[PDB]
Ligand binder design. Structure first.
Ligand SMILES: CC(C)CCC[C@@H](C)[C@H]1CC[C@H]2[C@@H]3CC=C4C[C@@H](O)CC[C@]4(C)[C@H]3CC[C@]12C
Ligand SMILES: CC(C)CCC[C@@H](C)[C@H]1CC[C@H]2[C@@H]3CC=C4C[C@@H](O)CC[C@]4(C)[C@H]3CC[C@]12C
Ligand SMILES: CC1(C)CC(=O)N(CCCCN2CCN(c3ncccn3)CC2)C(=O)C1
Lengths: 334, 232, 55, 216, 276
């Protein structure tokens, strides 16, 4: 059936080439480019004493959770730089952290292969482990809450999982990646999510159906980062091959490539602005590069980190970008 | 979550007495803890505040010097050392949980209190109405006014609403003006602005019958408005 | 492996049964969303220092 | 600041105090990455020292060791090998009696050792090499020659010389002056590997301090 | 022109000393990778040499160009106090750095479990305390157009032994122990490529300790030889003006050479200057 699979791939790529009526690069020639994004670090969040691997913004656009290898999960009041909580993780080898859209839970995980859910709002004043989601046989690289009771986690066991937090059970398993799955991105309607993995492919998953709707293969190296466009009809990846690609769900094709000659290091994190015209990618060359998502031009550079920028996020109100990094510092930019 | 105050009883005027509240079932060391007293027929009056870790301590000017608040975190006990107990120190003393981070809910839990009987620029919170008679199923609004604007430059208005039910400890209803407390049914609403505030009950039950208190948490000499008792 | 091969073939068949719109229409939709929300983009169009909560 | 903002700032300061205390207590731990290939004697030396990552805590002669057994991560190491970028030493386990086995076990061990020595995140990370099952290797070397694994041996067929050649093949993968490989031969029964790890870690710390001063 | 050429030479010396020490302090303050206990001692040495270069060397350079103390007599006492304080603190900073290196090389367990910035602060405070203990007696109880340190006898032993000879002995002993430990480690690592690298590392140890102790000695030993002998040579020892000036300014040039030895030769400092 290998010949049938190869024929199906060939005819699918022929169908994709059929839809290539006009590249996104051509359409946006006659539109005004953003001049030059020059953002400035507004807050610097200090208190992580090791490498920060993940941060997530709260939906209130003021609280953010960060995960670092010092075994502490810190929730920051990014307006005042106050530390709302310092959550000591049972396993210090955290690789991902999520903040619930409600704000009542944070999740984290890593080399322990467990998604630990933390109840931020308990009757007692402590943040305690609400649930430990065991069942992944590889490290957890990403996790995102659907709501207070559902969280989707990607793993190094090449499979993503949808969890019922209350019962601690894998509601759905998202198999189909051949390499380590490195990132997740929920669509704004949370009816479907993309996941980029180490097979240099990003697969579009239906949360309810539990099956891969589409597979996107433009990258050459391991995809470390993925993020939907704000409207949910597109997403952008970030891989080790020093390029970001914008894939459209409906067009089922890569629309734009965000690469520059002097950039050779991999991309650890990608995110969009509120309008989505800016693609903010964090690179291993210690800085975050802002790209005009409609023209693939480096609008700006977020220099200011002294190590690999591992994580970055944009607030839901789009006011600020926070970039974590391996230098143990979180910086809010605006 | 429990807070069991201990002490009280008859004390001769000018004497001394130690008030202890044994916290149970919560992370007592991470909570700022208060003493709030209430004279046998008067409203609530905040006595003292010891922060989490004993870092910051405040007293009411009517007890400052005579009173000393302390906490025993390993033993989860909050103390009030009272000296020179005047006749106006005759009140039920409630120990109050309070935790302060962004979005927290201070004053959410109160202890059962102890009756202490003494033998023979503060913001003025003035909820002027009192003894409001209401009927079940009706919607009542409870007024509150502040001498100074409780609204802070940060956007937060530090007005609290409590429910002294008959024979029961106060219970937080609305912690920061228009913020509904946990476990409080969403028939209470917080409204108002600046210096004037109103607490609305959409459809009051027999559970809602009690005395409703304002409290400001803007400047630290926390003050209450004499309770607007709701009666059937 | 027959099972893995048939699962791959079925997955590719599911990939094939996708109604792919034109990429020009997709880019038009993306540009339209970017322009219809450019004003609601504090990063692209910096807000004044009064409206900035990080100042 | 408001009163509640004052108390929130005080809580944040207490949190920073606790974070500082924890980081101070954590910087005094010697972080060891236990690494190897399956049937190699990783489990034996762990049992001597005494999910997805197993962490072994043991204090030996006033020095605290955090030994990270990551053998349950059957995934791409390079996606998490950077989490151990700051380990004092990598403890690499090799089954000496793996030249005559296939899963070639010893060639796989050499390939893993090379990929770990020349990993970018481990440029200056020394390695405490353990040549495990030396009794089994001695039993198998008088019957099975060291030619199943190494065809270009062209040497004798005794236990000592064959094991020295194996250790030399492993050490030849270093290709760096700023790290050392502390090869030790273990028989899965000697209660000394803790001392060997301690001595190698002591030597690594001393050599690092000498390097800082320009004395190395 | 003798005023002008001397002024330019000493001014370039002072400017280079200020620039080098200030750049070391700025590198440690800015770069967070350069904030180590050892780096704390190195940057405290840079601070001490900066104090020397900004307080002593301008007034000393004016006193050298004009060949007389044109300032006041209370300013002369202040100059002597700052000179002795800051130079003693620089020498004892060398000793503190040597002691820290000795503890790091011979005591890895202490280096991991007990060595904290508190120890760097204790060492720095100790060096400054010894500087004060040497420089205060002239102000308290052991004391025209010339500003000279107290040429006493008891204070001469006190100020030369307490500021250089005890430091010299301590640094010699500590770096001899350090050399023994470095050699022992290199022999432990002691096929031909390994031994060639061992010989190279031994050459590196010899050259590094040579730079350290030779710069220290060449800068300061002439000064303390002259400072121990002349207060005892009532007439048997006359000091040529040019020579004695060269000795004094060798001692001062130690504060120019200290950042080079301890910072501008350190690879971490070079990388951090590159980052800046
Ligand atoms: C004013 C200046 C000259 C004072 C500085 C003295 C310096 C430059 C001189 C005096 C002693 C000399 C050192 C003496 C010993 C050795 C060890 C040898 O294996 C390498 C050269 C080396 C390291 C010399 C380097 C230069 C040196 C350090
Ligand atoms: C690079 C550095 C370390 C080299 C050594 C610098 C010192 C030792 C040298 C350089 C310039 C020299 C000075 C040049 C000018 C004079 C004026 C003369 O009437 C007395 C000697 C005196 C004051 C010299 C003292 C020693 C001196 C300061
Ligand atoms: C040369 C001159 C023309 C110009 C000049 O600068 N000076 C002063 C030199 C002082 C040099 N100090 C003396 C005091 N020190 C000290 N340190 C420690 C212990 C004891 N003593 C430091 C060095 C002259 O005498 C004439």
């Amino acid at each position: 059936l290998r010949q049938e699979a190869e024929q199906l791939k060939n005819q699918i790529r022929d169908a994709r080439k059929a839809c290539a009526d006009a590249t996104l690069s051509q359409i946006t020639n006659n539109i005004d480019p953003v001049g030059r994004i020059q953002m400035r670090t507004r807050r610097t969040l200090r208190g992580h004493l090791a490498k920060i691997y993940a941060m997530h913004w709260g939906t209130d656009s003021r609280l953010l959770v960060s995960a670092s290898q010092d075994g502490k999960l810190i929730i920051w009041d990014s307006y005042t730089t106050n530390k709302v909580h310092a959550i000591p993780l049972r396993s210090s080898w955290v690789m991902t952290c999520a903040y619930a859209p409600s704000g009542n839970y944070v999740a984290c995980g890593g080399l322990d292969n467990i998604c630990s859910i933390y109840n931020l709002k308990t009757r007692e004043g402590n943040v305690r482990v609400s649930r430990e989601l065991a069942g992944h046989t590889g490290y957890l690289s990403c996790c995102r809450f659907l709501d207070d009771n559902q969280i989707v986690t990607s793993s190094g066991d090449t499979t993503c999982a949808l969890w019922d937090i209350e019962t601690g059970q894998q509601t759905t398993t998202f198999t189909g990646h051949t390499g380590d799955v490195m990132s997740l991105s929920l669509a704004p309607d949370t009816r479907l999510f993309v996941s980029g993995a180490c097979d240099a492919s990003a697969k579009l998953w239906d949360v309810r159906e539990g099956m891969c709707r589409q597979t996107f293969t433009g990258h050459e190296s391991d995809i470390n980062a993925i993020c939907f466009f704000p409207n949910g009809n597109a997403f952008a990846t970030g891989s080790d091959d020093a390029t970001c690609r914008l894939f459209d769900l409906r067009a089922d094709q890569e629309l734009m490539t965000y690469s520059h000659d002097n950039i050779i290091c991999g991309i650890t994190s990608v995110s969009f602005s509120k309008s989505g015209r800016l693609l903010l990618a964090g690179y291993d060359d210690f800085n975050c590069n802002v790209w005009d998502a409609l023209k693939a031009d480096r609008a700006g550079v977020l220099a200011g980190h002294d190590n690999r920028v591992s994580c970055l996020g944009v607030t839901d109100d789009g006011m600020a970008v926070a970039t974590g990094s391996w230098d143990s510092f979180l910086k809010i930019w605006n | 979550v429990q807070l069991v105050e201990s002490g009280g009883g008859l004390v001769q005027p000018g004497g001394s007495r130690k008030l202890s509240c044994s916290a149970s079932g919560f992370a007592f060391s991470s909570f700022g803890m208060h003493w709030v007293r209430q004279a046998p027929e008067k409203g609530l009056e905040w006595v003292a505040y010891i922060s989490s870790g004993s870092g910051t301590i405040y007293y009411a000017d009517t007890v400052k010097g005579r009173f000393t608040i302390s906490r025993d975190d390993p033993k989860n006990t909050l103390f009030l050392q009272m000296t020179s107990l005047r006749s106006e120190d005759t009140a039920m003393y409630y120990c109050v949980r309070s935790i302060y981070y962004y979005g927290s809910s201070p004053f959410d839990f109160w202890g059962q209190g102890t009756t202490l009987t003494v033998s023979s620029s503060d913001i003025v919170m003035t909820q002027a109405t009192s003894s409001v008679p209401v009927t079940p199923g009706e919607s009542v609004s409870i007024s509150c006014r502040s001498s100074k604007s409780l609204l802070h430059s940060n956007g937060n208005t530090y007005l609290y609403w409590f429910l002294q039910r008959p024979g029961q400890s106060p219970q937080l209803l609305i912690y920061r003006m228009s913020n509904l407390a946990s476990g409080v049914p969403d028939r209470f609403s917080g409204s108002g602005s600046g210096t004037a505030f109103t607490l609305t009950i959409s459809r009051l039950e027999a559970e809602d019958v009690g005395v409703y208190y304002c409290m400001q948490h803007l400047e630290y000499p926390l003050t209450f408005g004499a309770g607007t008792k709701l009666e059937l | 492996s027959i099972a893995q091969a048939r699962k791959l073939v079925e997955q590719l068949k599911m990939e094939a049964n996708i109604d792919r719109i034109k990429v020009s229409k997709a880019a038009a939709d993306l540009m339209a969303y970017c322009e219809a929300h450019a004003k609601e983009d504090p990063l692209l169009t910096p807000v004044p220092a009064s409206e900035n909560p990080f100042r | 600041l408001s009163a509640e903002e004052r108390a929130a700032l005080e809580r944040s300061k207490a949190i920073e105090k606790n974070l500082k205390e924890d980081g101070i207590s954590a910087a005094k731990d010697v972080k060891l990455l236990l690494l190897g290939a399956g049937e190699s004697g990783k489990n034996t030396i762990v049992k001597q020292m005494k999910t997805g990552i197993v962490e072994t805590h043991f204090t030996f002669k006033n020095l605290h060791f955090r030994l990270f057994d990551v053998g349950a991560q059957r995934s791409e190491r390079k996606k998490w090998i950077h989490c151990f970028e700051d380990v004092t030493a990598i403890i690499f386990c090799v089954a000496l009696s793996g030249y005559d086995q296939v899963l070639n076990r010893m060639h796989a061990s050499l390939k893993l050792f090379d990929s770990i020595c020349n990993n970018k995140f481990f440029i200056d990370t020394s390695i405490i090499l353990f040549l495990n099952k030396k009794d089994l290797f001695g039993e198998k070397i008088k019957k099975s020659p060291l030619t199943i694994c190494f065809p270009e041996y062209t040497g004798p067929n005794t236990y000592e010389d064959a094991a020295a050649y194996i250790q030399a093949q492993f050490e030849s993968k270093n290709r760096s002056p700023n790290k050392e490989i502390y090869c030790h031969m273990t028989c899965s029964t000697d209660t000394n590997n803790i001392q060997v790890v301690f001595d190698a870690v002591t030597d690594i710390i001393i050599a690092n301090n000498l390097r800082g001063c320009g004395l190395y | 022109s003798y005023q002008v050429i001397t002024s330019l030479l000493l001014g370039t010396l002072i400017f280079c000393a200020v620039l080098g020490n200030a750049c070391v302090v700025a590198a440690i303050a800015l770069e967070r990778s350069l904030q180590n206990v050892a780096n704390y001692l190195i940057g405290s040495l840079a601070v001490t040499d900066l104090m020397v270069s900004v307080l002593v060397l301008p007034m000393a350079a004016l006193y050298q160009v004009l060949n007389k103390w044109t300032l006041g007599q209370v300013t002369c006492d202040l100059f002597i106090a700052l000179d002795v304080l800051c130079c003693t603190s620089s020498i004892w900073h060398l000793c503190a750095i040597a002691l820290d290196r000795y503890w790091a090389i011979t005591d890895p367990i202490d280096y991991v479990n007990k060595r904290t910035p508190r120890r760097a602060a204790a060492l720095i405070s100790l060096t400054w305390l010894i500087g004060f203990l040497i420089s205060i007696p002239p102000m308290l109880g052991w004391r025209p157009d010339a500003c000279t340190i107290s040429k006493d006898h008891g204070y001469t032993i006190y100020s030369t032994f307490g500021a250089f000879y005890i430091p010299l002995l301590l640094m010699l002993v500590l770096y001899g122990r350090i050399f023994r430990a470095a050699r022992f480690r290199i022999r432990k690592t002691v096929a031909e490529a390994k031994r060639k690298m061992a010989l190279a590392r031994e050459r590196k140890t010899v050259k590094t300790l040579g730079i350290i102790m030779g710069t220290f000695i060449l800068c300061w030993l002439p000064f303390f030889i002259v400072a121990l002998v002349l207060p005892f040579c009532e007439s048997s020892c006359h000091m040529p003006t040019l020579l004695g000036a060269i000795i004094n300014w060798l001692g001062y040039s130690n504060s120019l050479l200290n950042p080079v030895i301890y910072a501008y030769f350190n690879k971490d400092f070079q990388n951090a200057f590159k980052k800046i």
